Design a protein around this ligand. Structure first.
Ligand SMILES: *[C@@H]1O[C@H](CO)[C@@H](O)[C@H](O)[C@H]1NC(C)=O
Lengths: 48, 47
């Protein structure tokens, strides 16, 4: 809920991080937008 | 890339002599890092 430089696994980018409502499938790691920009991501340490 | 990758699905059905006329997605069940050449293969039946 604050603007941050996020990085998961080398994905440096600047944004508000927010808790998603997206039901990613079990195997599934990055979410890309319609624009093919990353717009969601599973945390590597914790299951969110 | 030397990963032998398996995608699969289960659904229950009710058919006698056909492959189910429809559409479904298979998820990656494993991505085995094996790196070998393959040309042929065979399947294993209970007897
Ligand atoms: C796999 O073996 C066949 C037959 O010996 C050969 O033609 C083929 O080039 C081999 N695969 C690779 C990646 O070289």
């Amino acid at each position: 809920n604050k603007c941050v430089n996020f990085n998961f696994n080398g994905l440096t980018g600047t944004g508000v991080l927010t808790e998603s409502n997206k039901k990613f499938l079990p195997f599934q790691q990055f979410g890309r937008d319609i624009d093919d920009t990353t717009d969601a991501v599973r945390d590597p340490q914790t299951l969110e | 890339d030397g990963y032998f990758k398996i995608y699969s699905k289960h659904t229950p059905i009710n058919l006698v002599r056909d492959l189910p006329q429809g559409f479904s997605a298979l998820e990656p069940l494993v991505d085995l890092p094996i790196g070998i050449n393959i040309t042929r293969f065979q399947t294993l039946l209970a007897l």
